[PDB]
Design a protein around this ligand. Structure first.
Ligand SMILES: O=C1Cc2cc(Nc3ncncc3Cl)ccc2N1
Ligand SMILES: O=C1Cc2cc(Nc3ncncc3Cl)ccc2N1
Ligand SMILES: [Cl-]
Ligand SMILES: [Cl-]
Lengths: 4, 124, 124, 4
């Protein structure tokens, strides 16, 4: 999971 | 927004759509190419091809279970492109590049047409 | 094999599937949650959720145009997860995390259940 | 395009  | 994003989600979705295709699960159309038949999901074909997008948004054709491609279309070129639609992988070879590019132009798959043009230009 | 791969293909496919959903094109099922209705594509739901995969591979349920979820399911949690299925983006907030995790457990969306568990553990 |  990432900060888009 | 303040959303988080799962990097592998789109690839995992496509991998699962290809598994459904392999097992012939919920396929809703047959594409006929020079008497070679290919089962697929209309939505995946529309998401990948300007031609299929135009076909399945037509009020009469959206309801067809069989689509016949132009007789000039090569079944192997179509098969390679159908595989690309469901995997992101293109089996481009010296022996098939001309058929693949011609099929991608007909199907309106602009990124495929682009890499074929570049690969042909490198060999000249 | 000796394939080439188009990096953005899977993301572009998912973006187009979400555009079809927005325009209600070729959606083939309604998911009913506490009298809130959500139109979607069965194949995308199956590709994202172990529950929908099990539902639409069942010989009788594969033919249903309406699926009713358990009354304990929260429509907002479902809406957030449906958006995630079609975009890879999860709108996870302090105010919705419990409903989102409960909905993801029911839908069998293991990666979502994982990030909810981790976000909850960080706040304790 | 890349070599996967
Ligand atoms: O090269 C290409 C690939 C491609 C895909 C589509 N598909 C869609 N476009 C927009 N909204 C939904 C969909 Cl399904 C249309 C044109 C082209 N041209
Ligand atoms: O967490 C999850 C997400 C998910 C998706 C599916 N889908 C499929 N699996 C295998 N072949 C085809 C499909 Cl469509 C099954 C289980 C789970 N569990
Ligand atoms: Cl393309
Ligand atoms: Cl997930």
């Amino acid at each position: 999971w990432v900060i888009p | 927004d303040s959303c988080i994003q799962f990097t592998r989600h789109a690839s995992d979705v496509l991998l699962n759509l290809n598994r459904l295709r392999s097992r012939d699960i919920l396929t809703d159309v047959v594409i006929v190419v020079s008497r070679e038949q290919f089962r697929a999901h209309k939505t995946v074909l529309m998401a990948c091809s300007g031609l299929f997008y135009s076909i399945f948004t037509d009020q009469l054709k959206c309801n067809l279970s069989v689509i016949n491609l132009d007789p000039e279309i090569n079944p192997e070129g179509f098969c390679i492109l159908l595989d690309f639609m469901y995997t992101s992988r293109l089996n481009l070879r010296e022996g098939n590049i001309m058929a693949v590019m011609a099929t991608a132009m007909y199907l309106q798959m602009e990124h495929v047409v682009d890499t074929c043009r570049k690969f042909i230009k490198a060999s000249e």
